[model samples]
Target: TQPQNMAFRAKATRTARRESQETFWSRFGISQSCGSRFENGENLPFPIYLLLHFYIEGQITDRQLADLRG
Candidate 1:
């Protein structure tokens, strides 16, 4: 069922609370445009998804994420 596969919405909600689609991708060192595609459709790899989850949960700050990527 379409509804059954909708768990992805959880992540979507998480994204909505943040800045913008473009900025959201920047946090992970990805291009804002690429990030939009991921946000719009991809379920995402575990590693990348975790980093984003950690950021939204306040487990890490944005600058810390930037340094981590740097």
Candidate 2:
């Protein structure tokens, strides 16, 4: 997907979970400021995009996410 669409989805995902920027981004080891950039339509790194995609689709679980973060 395009960067703009990905950005939109990322923000939407955080909103859906009722998470703050820090809360959502921290799950992936990203800083709130940096995450804000992506939410504002900056291009995400490919791997991060993939993770977000999988997370959104429920293909990855919270436990798996913690493992991945480590």
Candidate 3:
């Protein structure tokens, strides 16, 4: 669990640079509250999970961008 948590936190830290949870979620058109709620031990719906994973991987593909609207 620690490693998973660490992985999530590491991704979180990488993104939060000059980007608040609010801001980042906004860019993806994801709700701010939903964003916060899903941050920890949280299971985002598949698309959300996918994009966050994409974000953490430091690449945002067109599919991910499209998911924001889906």
Candidate 4:
């Protein structure tokens, strides 16, 4: 997706989860500063996009997320 599209999707996902930018991005091991950039329409890394996709789709469970964070 384009940067704007990714940004829109990211914000939508975060809000849907009722999570702050810090909490949402931290779950994926991203710093709040960087996550803010992405939420502001900066280019999103492909891997991060994939992770977001999987996460939103429930393919990444809380246990898996903890493992990923570690």
Name the top lDDT candidate.
2
On TM-score, the stronger of 2 and 4 is 2
List ranges where model 4 is wrong by over 4 Å. 2-4
Candidate 2 local lDDT, 13-44, one digit each (tens):
78988999999888888899999998887878
Estimate the TM-score of every prediction: 0.60, 0.82, 0.58, 0.79
**Local distance difference test scores for all models:** 0.60, 0.83, 0.61, 0.80
**Model 1 segments more than 4 A misplaced:** 1-18
Top candidate when judged by TM-score against the true structure: 2
Runs of candidate 2 exceeding 4 Å displacement? 67-70
What's model 4's TM-score? 0.79
Candidate 2: worst 10 consecutive residues by lDDT?
Answer: 1-10
lDDT of 1 by residue, 5-55 (tens): 232553475467766756666667777666665656655666766665565
Better of 2 and 4 by lDDT: 2
Mind giving the per-residue lDDT tens digits that candidate 4 earns over 1-70? 3534766787897899798988888888899999889887788888888887777678987688878677
Candidate numbers, best TM-score first, in rank order = 2, 4, 1, 3
How many clashes does each candidate structure show, in the order listed?
Answer: 0, 0, 0, 0
